């Protein structure tokens, strides 16, 4: 049972904690926590490639894409590894994240420890938008809060 954690901070007021857990190797990952300070609605949720926050959330680079694929919702098969789709913030701007994904891992070639979790401005269109940008970033808009994923 490997655990991991991330603390999301930004320039704006957005901030939260997201925990990872992976019972079995190369198994599935439980991802859970709470982001507060969001605009009510949907927000793109991504693991970007680098754990670099020197120029803030910009340094995180692109979505984690070790297999060199196009963008997609987490349920699709054409997807980046760090493409986790969208989180929902309520009338109080709090998103209670509760995901379970089976592509990202805490170990091996798909390991995200040392990479950056990022909550985005708008909503990820899951690649179904119909312009070149939707197949890369998914038009999730700019980056609101980020953090390096560390070990627990």
């Amino acid at each position, epitope marked *: 049972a490997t655990k991991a954690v991330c603390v999301l901070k930004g320039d704006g007021p957005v901030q939260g904690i997201i925990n990872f857990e992976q019972k079995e190797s190369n198994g599935p990952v439980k991802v859970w926590g709470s982001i507060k300070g969001l*605009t009510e609605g949907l927000h793109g949720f991504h693991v970007h490639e680098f754990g670099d926050n020197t120029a803030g959330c910009t340094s995180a680079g692109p979505h984690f894409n070790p297999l060199s694929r196009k963008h997609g*919702g987490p349920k699709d098969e054409e997807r980046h590894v760090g493409d986790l789709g969208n989180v929902t913030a309520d009338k109080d701007g709090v998103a209670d994240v509760s995901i379970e994904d089976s592509v990202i891992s805490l170990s091996g070639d798909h390991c995200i420890i040392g990479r950056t979790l990022v909550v985005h401005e708008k909503a990820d269109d899951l690649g179904k938008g119909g312009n070149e940008e939707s197949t890369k970033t998914g038009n999730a808009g700019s980056r609101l809060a980020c953090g390096v994923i560390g070990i627990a």
Partner: nanobody, 114 residues
Framework: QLQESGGGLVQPGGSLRLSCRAS????????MGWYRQAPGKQPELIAT?????????NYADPVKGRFTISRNNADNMVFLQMNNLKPEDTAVYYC?????????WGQGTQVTVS
């Protein structure tokens, strides 16, 4: 739960304004989109609106620079302002959320360009 209106029959080059009233429960995802079920095709997403405040619009390549999406937060409404209509835009325009699991489609509105 999703109610469209505002299509009709228009000469090429014309303009229309589609209007959709959505449930509070759907609208408060603030990620809404106008899909067009293109002739014999599956509904393609043509324009999105998400974000804070009055929101931010994103246009699929065939309409970019001719369609404008917008919303009215107090009224749970979404509007698609279509200008310079080409023949190709003939279809039935549905309105629905994007980026999550879709709601049962509404009736949609008929847009005919000839």
């Amino acid at each position: 739960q999703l109610q469209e209106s505002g299509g009709g029959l228009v000469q090429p080059g014309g303009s229309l304004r589609l209007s959709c009233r959505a449930s509070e429960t759907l609208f408060s995802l603030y990620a809404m989109g106008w899909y067009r079920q293109a002739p014999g095709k599956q509904p393609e997403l043509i324009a999105t609106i998400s974000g804070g405040g009055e929101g931010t619009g994103n246009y699929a390549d065939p309409v970019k620079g001719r369609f404008t999406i917008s919303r009215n937060n107090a009224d749970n409404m979404v509007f698609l302002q279509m200008n310079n209509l080409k023949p190709e835009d003939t279809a039935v325009y549905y309105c629905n959320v994007y980026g999550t699991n879709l709601a049962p489609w509404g009736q949609g509105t008929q847009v005919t360009v000839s």
